[PDB]
Write an enzyme that holds these catalytic residues in place. Structure first.
Site, PDB file in Angstrom:
ATOM      1  N   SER A   1     -18.749  -0.253 -33.177  1.00 15.30           N
ATOM      2  CA  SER A   1     -20.194  -0.123 -33.297  1.00 15.30           C
ATOM      3  C   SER A   1     -20.715  -0.864 -34.534  1.00 15.30           C
ATOM      4  O   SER A   1     -19.986  -1.140 -35.496  1.00 15.30           O
ATOM      5  CB  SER A   1     -20.603   1.356 -33.340  1.00 15.30           C
ATOM      6  OG  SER A   1     -20.756   1.863 -34.660  1.00 15.30           O
TER       7      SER A   1
ATOM      8  N   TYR B   1     -21.867   7.782 -36.687  1.00 15.55           N
ATOM      9  CA  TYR B   1     -21.555   6.500 -36.068  1.00 15.55           C
ATOM     10  C   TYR B   1     -20.324   5.873 -36.708  1.00 15.55           C
ATOM     11  O   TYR B   1     -19.457   5.331 -36.010  1.00 15.55           O
ATOM     12  CB  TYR B   1     -22.753   5.549 -36.157  1.00 15.55           C
ATOM     13  CG  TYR B   1     -23.944   5.904 -35.270  1.00 15.55           C
ATOM     14  CD1 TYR B   1     -23.907   5.673 -33.895  1.00 15.55           C
ATOM     15  CD2 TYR B   1     -25.137   6.384 -35.817  1.00 15.55           C
ATOM     16  CE1 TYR B   1     -24.990   5.973 -33.084  1.00 15.55           C
ATOM     17  CE2 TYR B   1     -26.236   6.676 -35.006  1.00 15.55           C
ATOM     18  CZ  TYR B   1     -26.153   6.468 -33.645  1.00 15.55           C
ATOM     19  OH  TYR B   1     -27.240   6.759 -32.846  1.00 15.55           O
TER      20      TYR B   1
ATOM     21  N   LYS C   1     -16.574   5.241 -35.370  1.00  9.11           N
ATOM     22  CA  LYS C   1     -15.976   3.920 -35.521  1.00  9.11           C
ATOM     23  C   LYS C   1     -14.591   4.029 -36.141  1.00  9.11           C
ATOM     24  O   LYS C   1     -13.616   3.484 -35.612  1.00  9.11           O
ATOM     25  CB  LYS C   1     -16.878   3.018 -36.365  1.00  9.11           C
ATOM     26  CG  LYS C   1     -16.234   1.679 -36.745  1.00  9.11           C
ATOM     27  CD  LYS C   1     -17.255   0.598 -37.075  1.00  9.11           C
ATOM     28  CE  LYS C   1     -17.849   0.789 -38.467  1.00  9.11           C
ATOM     29  NZ  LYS C   1     -18.359  -0.502 -39.056  1.00  9.11           N
TER      30      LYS C   1
END
Lengths: 269, 265, 272, 271
Positions: B163, B174, B178
């Protein structure tokens, strides 16, 4: 107007994206471009030279020990590209300067450069582990090639490096662990920023490849490699050649400052 | 007889080198191969999907609420390859198991898989859970099913896209997902080594759907930090995906190809 | 502020203040006056830390889910003379995490030290499919650590003080289901580095990474599995929980006021 | 099953090795009563703070000096803390000076239980300068070699090598470069020692970040301001923030701890 934090010579930002072919396979074409590949009388450098010729590039070949005119003449018969061979001592700054200048004048420019620093290792009266990249010739090569890239506003420079798990030294950083890859990454990340207005700069880190560089070792030492390599084998020279084309061609116009590892998985944290 | 230390399903060592065309360009050919590419109704997924078709592969594209059979029609008419668009919910494992099962029946096999869960497209406890489910479990769910097809064919190449959301408070989920993806991709490369390569693609700031929202004052802050001085385009990731998917990269696994215009990798 | 920060502009004008510390090295390890919350402290590693902080002089909130533990907290109170209370919580339940941590703030007034032990506690029975194991492991060993930090970070930030210890797990070096375990550990290590930055005005965040410890999380392992552990460990054995305890005191106490974003590895040299 | 031989160092004997016997009180684990510590570079900044901590923790202390006499510091430890302390003049670069110094230290004190190797630091001066330091690992090597012999014979010991963080540009004389090279070389010595000494000693490195001392009493305010700017905690550290880990690694608080790097840098090392 918006100014770079990395290099004020990029001009007002953003720099503006290249116009690429709609087709992915064209991105890999080196038709119309000129590659200069050091150490190309055998091993990696030869393999890369021939791939580049297959991709349509004119190829300058570097030799010193054994002449490579027959390799240059072979690139022409087989692929119909221009190829000449150049005798040069890669650790002599004056001949690295001479030779690049000679290649530029002969081909008109240099679009792609691969610095394959020559490799030594000891041998006394006797043997039973440590090989050495000649980073200085890389430095002289990139200093010269950078000038051409600036004047033309375009360029890809690939530096052959190494993986951490291979004890590879540089002559001024000898140690019982890898010192050469931090030195290549440094040299790479530095040029990547310096050359950002006009060129990309990247490294290829091969693992254990069945070629003149590790083909000093015995079948018993090579066995220690196959056991640590997740793919279970050594690499063939034809398994690096695609990455050398990814980095040289318009396939990688956003790729700079990077290291592509081709080691069968040997790195692995 | 030299046994392996990373994984013993390699058998007596050394494993054999694959047969390779002797010309470079032929190495990037996907002719005769089948790719499945998540998040391919737009953005990076669609760019990769079109690229693989151009390389000669049949392509199975994926989609969410935005039907894309027309995008499959487009690949089919333009490039002379089979294509079919599948509706799926990457966050639910039964749909992932179904979708990949379908795709194998409709296509015969899958030689190439691209997980793009991280680059596809209000209580913080639930926000954390959703990202993790999508960007991490979705990737793992796809992993498990495609590994069966790879294991039962002795060949495969898996791409996981890192990402970039989290470069654009809300970043922790996020980037945690990742991180976990980077680890899972390395663990899978060890485990699938008898039959599949596994690598990740890590894009920088790409000008595409997932960055459409960003303020010009925001985007401007990227441009001055990345040494190349701009955003990337999807057409600058496409070559990296071809390299990893194809025979150009048969000796590369467990690696991360960074395409970020220099944003110190 | 004149000199601003690249990492957290929430730090204010630099340099931040040097902390004020006892002249005697041994006083730095005292946890008198402070309150510590240790999850998974019914037994195992969680218990040993929970008891060692108590010897170090800290009120200890202990956690449990299955086997109740009010009897263990009483033992801490009775044996050491510190306030101690035992709480019940599904660490995978964000709602239960919030109340549990809110309650301890009330009974104790503050929390100075937190130890997320989800990776070394057995609360993560028969698994439906492989997707279920994965979701279970991520829910406890990653999302569970997250919920804890979000709640303790409010109280850490409120108070301008805090030491958070995340324990890296040992499962996945054991006996596959090692993929979810190691994947959740990797995500925890990144989480901990993220938190180290963003909490830097008010708290420290660190991980402890134990190798093979002879405790309740390895209480099933075959002699065949354990022998290879011995063979690859430079010290040639498994660890005892009493060899973990000194590092947890190191991170929790004023002994380590300048160490954040770090990993303390206690593994007899296993990683090289 | 049978006997199980180690794949690292076979001088361990049939595995497992027996765990040591430890106090059940954590605060006893950190005591150095009954132990002898030898701390190099201890007339100076980090060294002195570590020497004094070890005295506070109960240890007899052998301190080391070369240029600045340190007899008064040894006496200050004896009077303040009630502990045997002596000071040794030794040029740590002379392998022979190091050998005799540690032999003399074994006689006076009877044994050495804890050793701290602090490499001397230099930087470059000159007319065109108003950023790279280098440390002499040779002295670390000679000290490591000779203290190992004591640790082996006695069957116990703890060795700490002061290293550095990667983001501080630290060289050694045989590895000059525009990036840290001394951490890799220290991690390499500590890792090989931990394996070889496994049956009898523990070996770890401590890597400090930016400390307010005298190795860094040579930097302008504007240099220090950039270190503040990149350190999550927002400042330089104090030596008293180091002395904890030096006690952690020296004492029985870390009997299962060898081969490790304890980073105390206020967060400066981060992805």
């Amino acid at each position: 107007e918006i100014e770079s934090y990395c290099n004020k010579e990029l001009g007002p930002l953003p720099t503006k994206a290249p116009t690429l072919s709609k087709n992915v396979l064209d991105l890999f074409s080196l038709k119309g471009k000129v590659a200069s590949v050091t150490g190309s009388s055998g091993g990696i450098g030869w393999a890369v030279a021939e791939a580049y010729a297959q991709a349509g590039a004119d190829v300058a070949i570097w030799y010193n020990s054994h002449p490579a005119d027959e390799k240059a003449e072979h690139l022409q018969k087989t692929y119909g590209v221009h190829s000449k061979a150049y005798k040069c001592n890669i650790s002599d700054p004056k001949s690295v300067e001479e030779t690049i200048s000679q290649q530029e004048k002969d081909f008109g420019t240099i679009d792609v450069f691969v610095a394959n620093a020559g490799v030594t290792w000891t041998q006394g009266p006797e043997i039973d582990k440590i090989i050495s990249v000649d980073l200085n010739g890389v430095y002289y090569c990139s200093h010269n090639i950078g000038k051409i890239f600036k004047k033309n506003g375009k360029g890809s420079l690939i530096i052959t490096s190494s993986i951490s798990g291979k004890i590879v030294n540089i002559p001024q950083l000898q140690a019982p662990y890898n010192t050469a890859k931090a030195a290549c990454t440094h040299l790479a990340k530095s040029l990547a920023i310096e050359w950002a207005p006009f060129a990309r700069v990247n490294t290829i880190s091969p693992g254990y490849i069945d070629t003149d560089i590790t083909d000093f070792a015995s079948k018993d030492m090579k066995a220690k490699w196959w056991q640590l390599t997740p793919l279970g084998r050594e690499g063939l020279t034809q398994e690096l050649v695609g990455g050398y084309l990814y980095l040289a061609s318009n396939a990688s116009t956003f790729t700079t400052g990077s290291d592509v590892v081709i080691d069968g998985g040997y790195t692995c944290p």
